[PDB]
Amino acid sequence: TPFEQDFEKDVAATQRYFDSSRFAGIIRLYTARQVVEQRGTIPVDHIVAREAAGAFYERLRELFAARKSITTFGPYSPGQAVSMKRMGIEAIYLGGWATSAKGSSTEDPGPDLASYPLSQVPDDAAVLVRALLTADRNQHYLRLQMSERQRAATPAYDFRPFIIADADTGHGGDPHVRNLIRRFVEVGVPGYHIEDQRPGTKKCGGGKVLVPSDEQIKRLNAARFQLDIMRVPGIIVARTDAEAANLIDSRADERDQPFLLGALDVPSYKSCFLAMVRRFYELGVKELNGHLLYALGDSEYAAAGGWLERQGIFGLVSDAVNAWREDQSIDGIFDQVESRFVAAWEDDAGLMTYGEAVADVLEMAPEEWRAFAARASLHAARAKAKELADPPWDCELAKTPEGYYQIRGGIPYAIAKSLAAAPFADILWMETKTADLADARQFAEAIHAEFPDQMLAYNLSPSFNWDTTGMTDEEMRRFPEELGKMGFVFNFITYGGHQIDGVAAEEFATALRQDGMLALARLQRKMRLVESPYRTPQTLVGGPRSDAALAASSGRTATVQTEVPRKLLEEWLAMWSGHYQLKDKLRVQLRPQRAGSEVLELGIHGESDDKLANVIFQPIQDRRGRTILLVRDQNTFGAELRQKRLMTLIHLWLVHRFKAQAVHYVTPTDDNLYQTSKMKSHGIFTEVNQEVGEIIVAEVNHPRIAELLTPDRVALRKLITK
Amino acid sequence: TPFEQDFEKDVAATQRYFDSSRFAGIIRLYTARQVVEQRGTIPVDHIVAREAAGAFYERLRELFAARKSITTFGPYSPGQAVSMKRMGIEAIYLGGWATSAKGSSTEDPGPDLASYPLSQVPDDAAVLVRALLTADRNQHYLRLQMSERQRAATPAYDFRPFIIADADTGHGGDPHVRNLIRRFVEVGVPGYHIEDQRPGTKKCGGKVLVPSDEQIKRLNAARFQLDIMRVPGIIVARTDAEAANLIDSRADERDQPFLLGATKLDVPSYKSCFLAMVRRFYELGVKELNGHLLYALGDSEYAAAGGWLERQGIFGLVSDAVNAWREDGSIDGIFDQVESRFVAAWEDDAGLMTYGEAVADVLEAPEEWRAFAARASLHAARAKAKELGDPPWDCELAKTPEGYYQIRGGIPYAIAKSLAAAPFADILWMETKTADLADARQFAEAIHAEFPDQMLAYNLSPSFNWDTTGMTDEEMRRFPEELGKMGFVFNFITYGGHQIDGVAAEEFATALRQDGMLALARLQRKMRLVESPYRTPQTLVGGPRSDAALAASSGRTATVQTEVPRKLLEEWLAMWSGHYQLKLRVQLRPQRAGSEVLELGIHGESDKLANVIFQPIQDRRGRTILLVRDQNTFGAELRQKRLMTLIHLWLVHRFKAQAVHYVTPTDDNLYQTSKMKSHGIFTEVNQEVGEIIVAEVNHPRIAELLTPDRVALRKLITK
Amino acid sequence: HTPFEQDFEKDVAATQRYFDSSRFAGIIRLYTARQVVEQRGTIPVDHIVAREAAGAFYERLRELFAARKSITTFGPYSPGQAVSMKRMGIEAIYLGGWATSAKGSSTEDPGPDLASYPLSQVPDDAAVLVRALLTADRNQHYLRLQMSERQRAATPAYDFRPFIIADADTGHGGDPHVRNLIRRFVEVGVPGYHIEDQRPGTKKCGGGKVLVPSDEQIKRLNAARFQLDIMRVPGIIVARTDAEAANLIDSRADERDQPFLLGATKLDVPSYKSCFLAMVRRFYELGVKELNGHLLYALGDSEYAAAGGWLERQGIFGLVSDAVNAWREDQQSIDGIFDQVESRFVAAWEDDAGLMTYGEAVADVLEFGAPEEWRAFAARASLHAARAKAKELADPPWDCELAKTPEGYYQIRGGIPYAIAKSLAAAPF
Ligand SMILES: CC(=O)SCCNC(=O)CCNC(=O)[C@H](O)C(C)(C)COP(=O)(O)OP(=O)(O)OC[C@H]1O[C@@H](n2cnc3c(N)ncnc32)[C@H](O)[C@@H]1OP(=O)(O)O
Ligand SMILES: CC(=O)SCCNC(=O)CCNC(=O)[C@H](O)C(C)(C)COP(=O)(O)OP(=O)(O)OC[C@H]1O[C@@H](n2cnc3c(N)ncnc32)[C@H](O)[C@@H]1OP(=O)(O)O
Ligand SMILES: [Mg+2]
Ligand SMILES: [Mg+2]
Ligand SMILES: [Mg+2]
């Protein structure tokens, strides 16, 4: 029948899609049939997400093969996102931290607990995608008005929405994951990261709680299912938080069981904790009534009480409560007692893995056993131990009051989780607090041993104090490239945008109160220097394309020099190039040497864009406002261009551009000594003092500068020829 | 009856509210009864907006009385808004430009045409208010954990939502205004600005005004909604009449004096000529230009216009243009040239002027007439002119194709509109493109002549090139204060936040590509130096208060030196203060915001005993030099005790300085650096008298003085 | 005392009086007045619609409780329906997540009630109702002002106060989720909220419902109260239990739930999980590639072997062979065929395992050898306390771990007794 044919046709198409190389080494726990029966008969097309996902995946695979990587941050505004693509960053990260911090019209801002509605991050992403698509439309409109020569000159920015967005823990079970993924896809997002935390306890700070691996895998599988239904080859990033986690909310998964901690004649950690809290309450700290949450039996309170007295913990409580009375909030005092209690309980309980426990008995080889225990279920490890050494071990004893089991968190556990998830994820990510290449290497090597083609991702916390690492500035510069080499293809400063937004606001708000409208002038100057699009806001937001739309809608019936231009020096260099018969049209560039620096670089560029000469300098003012040009470096790279007064022309421009009274050269070379001395003879400088190898100080000859700058260019013509 | 009593009680309360000094000189076109009728019986309370509006209004009145002002900008994020208040700016602006530029989940970003849903700016404002209220809660939580002495030391920021938000043109008529105002009030916004543009054509760049009666009705509608909600909201009336050339009606007597008309009435209508010109293009084979098909203009009108177009040589220009088009093979540029030339020709021949200027030309008392014409209806001016023996004048001839009348835009028209609006608005604002104190003064003086107590507001366009004004840097610094003196109490850089957001993103993105993770290190360093709250993000977003909430919810059952510290110098100054029998604090901040130039200050208990203004600079190999532009030991009795020598020792250690350069030294500087050479702090000292001192640091002697035993150091202090 | 200290002490005192008022008689808070005031900041806010509605609504329900009378209502699907029911004289409104799921939104496809909508969804729905009620009141009042005193006495005036109890599901996560959900309800004027003791990820309207421990439920209710206290709204907290129909729980850590745990008594049987996965793997190995569910887990060979042994003995591998042959003769979707086998397999496993509570287990030992005295002790006893009492004088073989589902959920004896146990634990909150 036509009905049966249409179905079989789509099942076949879907099967080819499944079997394509895009999904090599990916396991789906469902069939093409199961996907097609969800799609109905009315066509839909999520083309933005579909095409972005394709291109973005191919690009990441290209960089993984070249041992290269994208280094990015989370933009805090659509402007930031459009800007980073202008500056040539290839992809964007979008995180839940920044989303929490921003809030919304109905959401108060706050810490990242994924307590916002699951629509929150998609809604944020939607703003970014609309900004990128609008930027593309505005750019394209302008490029159509341009000629072929202008199009070859004026650069075209890539505004494709290569975004990997935060899907938290999935905000519940599989219907929540599918809904979250659907909302991302609908607004054009091609990548999503899901972590193995328990939704209710999700955090970024100590007591992280993991879920079993089967739960995490189901989240990833659910996501893939939704992506398949929507015909979008979305990039699924599996994050593990197992590196720092100490708790798990279930012990049902065999892969987690090797990492479980167990205790014995000791009473349960829960019993002891609650009994200790009850003692604080009975001694008159009414604030600590947490024991009312539980219905713990008398026998349990008795046993725990016994242990608490023997170990001297009830002693510590009595002392603590007396310290409290003599002095108010008991936050600090209780903390001290708890830590001491925990230390005591761990110590007495003999808290270790079932591996470590059977290893102690053996006093099968020792190292041979470890290998078996590390890949063995609890039931399988007990069966093998009894067959050989069945020690006392209970993980139930060590449960928290909530009922969470304790586990051995660390990179080995992160590896175990990530390896389990690898067949269901396109990218693996181990959450790190500290930036450390060795930790990253341990992870990457372990993964690649079993999955050589598995792409990885690395997070760079903005709060990690980089100056405590002991790394050199050069090691910091190279850190992203080092990640790339180990197969971390996508590395991101999570809420970078939030940080720079804050600093910018502090600065401008302070500047406005300090210097009034001069604060705006200085910002405008900065924008003119780097030739920012923000120079012309009306154009930036797409005024030209909008004007065109108004014309179409109505059938066309609707109704001083601020800085010395670089062009001036370019004209002088034309005279110069003419006299010495160079075929080379010389261009002048004046930008900060590095982004945001007061230190500028003036560069002279040929037709090939090879740098023929440069000056690295910064203007500085004295207390009365006089300006000095501090020169730290200068070069005439062409040996054939030297001793023709090229640098004398550049200096004349700089002195005019910056209204300089003097020029200081720090750590001069010999060439510098010879140059400044002869520039004294041409009359550019009145006086020149030189401490060989340390500093040159050259006072500007204002009359001679004024003479050379006369628009007739007579004196300037003589200087160039003689 | 109880029903009648409850009503009469609320009408009386409402009447007292109307009659309160808050609304002195304000006209309402409705009664207390009409307000109470709307309120129902189920209580509501918009307390955030109500209390903010009260405090914010009183504050602006203080500032007005003192001829001072608030100078602010539009924050582009909730972080920016919280930050501005930390830095001590008292109030916030929120504009439709930035809202348009940002877009939303369902709104593509774009130019400011007020084409977003009228919910858009309120939704944006809501984010800001939630950020401010949350900041207050986070601050207050921390201050409760502090002791009374810690509270007296740590400053408390004012996070009250003093916001004036953009209500555009009102997004339609009175039900639209009331809905817009309601949405602002509901999210806690206490101030709103409404402009006298036509909603459909609203712009920031051919502006079209509405009659004054329409604008007044918008302002009255707003007041009505605010009264219903018991919120004494601040209504700002904006006029765009300074730059506007068009108005969508000639029905209001107040606008009629400014109407432009043709004096040469043998000319055909501007509309006829424009359409006839377009039809010619079409008929000559440019199918693209079919704009004339929008209208059903008669043959007689096309003929008359055609006649004029041929005589003036415009049909000539069209023929030439179409030939240029064919030879090349889009006609956007070509048509534009012809149109501008056509417009020039039509304006020239039509003799476009006001009915005032027209009757003034005939009389050749002159200056007496101007005064009458400027305050006269069109019908009243004609009656007075005929009586005095009535030139040819038609404004209909000059209408655009849409049917908009031409008007004489400028400050006089802005004044006329603002004076009409004054009894219905708390603040008046004349939209300006250029920043000019004289233009502002002309406006302010004209307003204050009739309304001495009328508070004003002034916009500072971020796109206005300040360096083209010819003002000095010092004049730019003083411009806000000068506005304040003329009674502009609230002055704002509209989309400042949008601009700084962009610059910050460009810089960091460039820096990350240039310098990798060193880009983050440098940002972190900057934050540590100024002690920014962004230093500790978890705290900034309210982690402590949130942790407390988790504890409450669960009943408590839930489970290396980067810089040489200022404290080191403070300890040295304790030794020093001890020996000379005098508690000195050290401060190291940028001299101005974002500057590489730092100021080290020494502060007493009463707070500045000494300072050094300097900047570190590196040579090409990385060696650091301290460049000192100023230094003071302000107390004459504290001099020549080696206070400055201690500060220098710290700075040299803090910045790993190889040398110290002093630019434009004084005599005291010469004597100081020379003696510091003898103590062995410097090996070599070169001095070009009055220009520069260069002093090379003696590394051995520095190392000796920095030994933690403080033996050498103690000897240095005691002499 | 400084003004700062005074302002604080004043609000703490006011808050303490509020706590101690008769409104909260028999209510336990796991936090102090101080902890509430710390959260409020210094800038006043006022949720007056919710506050006043909550007051009147609570008093009214108390009046009806004392008179042994009640409100009978339904969930309106539109603001018109809500205004209409108040006209017809129904005193209060219910608003449920089922209808919200079925309606969808501009960004939410309609569907079954899995609480998979954003937690803003039901509050947003409630907001429409509250605005409709307040607008109706304003319209009525306007007309009544135009009327004479005689007409007012003639024409009836309807009560449009927003007496709503709205669905807060499971709380949509942990305590920050509950507090956010409650905040959103209060902000739009809703005075009542119901929270159920289901696991958020598996929430359903009935088959296979999964409960949470009672400590988790209590924390949800306490979290809600905390948020309501911060906002100065005496909101009505409804604790729902799904324990009457539920068969599963996601933890065995709470002593109150332990009496209802089901365990195997025949401990030579392999785990239900092992047997289920082994059965699925057989289908896969016999050529049904569709059924690859076993690839979700990393079950050991020893476990697959033991389970395999049991599956063959019980004739289940037989049923699989038959099923796969039926499949081949027809190779269409195997949904129906697999279902029969699994149903037959589940029955077999439940019957051979001897599934009962530790209560029922020790009761059998004593009935072979006081009996009714023990039941009373077992029904209120932890698992550790019941084992200690049984060893003292009959400690039979019993394992609840054997009976866990593949997800790791424990089986429990659902029914009215379990509903009672949960509800009694929740009652003080
Ligand atoms: C603080 C610092 O900048 S230190 C870093 C300095 N950089 C270097 O040493 C890099 C290597 N050197 C160079 O690239 C170049 O030689 C530079 C940049 C120093 C000078 O560039 P040039 O284009 O040669 O300088 P320019 O020609 O303008 O010099 C002006 C006058 O000095 C003279 N001059 C320049 N170099 C020399 C030299 N080595 N010997 C004699 N005279 C010289 C020129 O001939 C000219 O005078 P004249 O035409 O009247 O004879
Ligand atoms: C930095 C610039 O480019 S602008 C110039 C700086 N600012 C000024 O001139 C403003 C006014 N001057 C001053 O405030 C002070 O004189 C300063 C800042 C220059 C020096 O401050 P002091 O705290 O006196 O410097 P300090 O005590 O460390 O001086 C170090 C040595 O120089 C000597 N010295 C400093 N000033 C004098 C002086 N006027 N006469 C003689 N000796 C002096 C000191 O006696 C000391 O040596 P000694 O104690 O062993 O005899
Ligand atoms: Mg993989
Ligand atoms: Mg007024
Ligand atoms: Mg109760």
Numbering used by the authors:
A (entry chain C): 12 to 216, 219 to 276, 279 to 342, 345 to 380, 391 to 415, 417 to 587, 602 to 764
B (entry chain A): 12 to 216, 220 to 343, 346 to 380, 392 to 416, 418 to 587, 602 to 624, 627 to 651, 653 to 764
C (entry chain B): 11 to 216, 219 to 342, 344 to 382, 392 to 415, 417 to 452
The paper states:
Isocitrate lyase (ICL) isoforms 1 and 2 are key enzymes in this process, through their roles in the glyoxylate and methylcitrate cycles. Each subunit comprises two distinct domains, with the N-terminal (residues 1–590) and the C-terminal (residues 603–766) domains connected by a flexible linker (residues 591–602). Our results provide strong evidence that ICL2 may act as a gate-keeping enzyme, allosterically regulating the glyoxylate shunt and the methylcitrate cycle, an essential mechanism during chronic infection when Mtb uses lipids as the primary carbon source.
To understand these results, we determined the crystal structure of Mtb ICL2 in the presence of acetyl-CoA at 2.36 Å resolution. Acetyl-CoA binding is mediated by extensive hydrogen bond interactions, which are exclusively formed with residues in the C-terminal domains. The two C-terminal dimers formed when acetyl-CoA binds seem to be more stable as indicated by the buried interface area (1105 Å2) compared with the area in the ligand-free form (975 Å2). These distinctive conformational changes seen in the crystal structures are confirmed by the SAXS scattering profiles for ICL2 in the presence of acetyl-CoA, which are markedly different from that of ligand-free ICL2. However, in the presence of acetyl-CoA, ICL2 displayed a remarkable 50-fold increase in catalytic efficiency (kcat/KM 37,200 ± 6000 M−1 s−1 at 27 °C).
